[PDB]
From TrEMBL:
This is Peptidyl-prolyl cis-trans isomerase. It is an enzyme of class 5 (isomerase). Ca(2+) 2 binds at residues 128-129, 189-190. Its EC number is 5.2.1.8. It catalyses: [protein]-peptidylproline (omega=180) = [protein]-peptidylproline (omega=0). Keywords: Calcium, Isomerase, Metal-binding, Rotamase. Mg(2+) binds at residues 128-129. It comes from Burkholderia pseudomallei (strain 1710b). PPIases accelerate the folding of proteins. Belongs to the FKBP-type PPIase family.
Length: 190
């Protein structure tokens, strides 16, 4: 009578247990509430087809552990860019404010995950924005490279290979050796 559905947004994988005759609205609304966003502003896909809120898992022949894609990026879709260094970035929200340039002291919120989807840190969890000198060589290389070109109000997803992160050493008993890091960075100020 109930089903578990995996919702993947490109950063994490969250699961939802829902009755097969409950409209997907419930899942979509619970997902959106986590992101601080209105449900209608997000796009959910199952088997490549747009989910409508009034559809039930029964309607769509869903089964236990089926995957739903949650699209949080701009209407029209997005592209993930791999740069010369092997850093990947994806602009989820394009900023409209000042552009971040090397040499500025910038202020951000961030969340970091491992590729398995476990969360290792968030500035949100400390209610403490994070400030750093962009291009200063004091943060990991993927950050110095990846935050450049963001605009204030922007949300950018960085996928950082370990040579641009913590390499073979890892960090703080929470980042393992040779791990890719996934950050969402929201630019607050420059
Ligand atoms: C005196 C030092 C204290 C000073 C600590 C702070 C200002 C508090 C600050 C919020 C860090 C967090 O403290 C809760 C915590 O953030 C993580 O959880 C994290 O999300 C992360 O990965 N971040 C933080 C956000 C920017 C990107 C990245 C980073 O680049 O962080 C940088 C980092 C660790 C760089 C290492 C430095 C050693 C090099 O050898 C290595 O080179 C490979 C790269 C941080 C910002 C350093 O510049 C400055 C510091 O370390 C780490 C997993 C572990 C880290 O705790 C320490
Ligand atoms: Cl509904």
């Amino acid at each position: 009578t109930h089903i578990n559905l995996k919702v993947s947004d490109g950063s994490s994988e969250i699961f939802f247990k829902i009755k097969k005759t409950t409209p997907l609205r419930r899942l979509m609304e619970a997902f959106a509430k986590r992101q601080g966003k209105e449900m209608d502003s997000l796009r959910f896909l199952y088997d490549g087809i747009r989910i409508q809120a009034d559809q039930t898992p029964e309607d769509l022949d869903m089964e236990d552990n089926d995957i739903i894609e949650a699209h949080r990026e701009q209407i029209g879709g997005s592209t993930v860019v791999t740069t010369e260094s092997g850093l990947k970035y994806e602009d989820l929200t394009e900023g409209s404010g000042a552009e971040a340039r090397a040499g500025q002291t910038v202020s951000v919120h961030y969340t970091g995950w491992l590729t398995d989807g476990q969360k290792f840190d968030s500035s949100k969890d400390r209610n403490d924005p994070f400030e750093f000198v962009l291009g200063g060589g004091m943060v990991i290389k993927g950050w110095d490279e990846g935050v450049q070109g963001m605009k204030v109000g922007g949300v950018r997803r960085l996928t950082i290979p370990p040579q641009l992160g913590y390499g073979a050493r890892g960090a703080g008993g929470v980042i393992p050796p040779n791990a890719t890091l996934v950050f969402e960075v929201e630019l607050l100020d420059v």
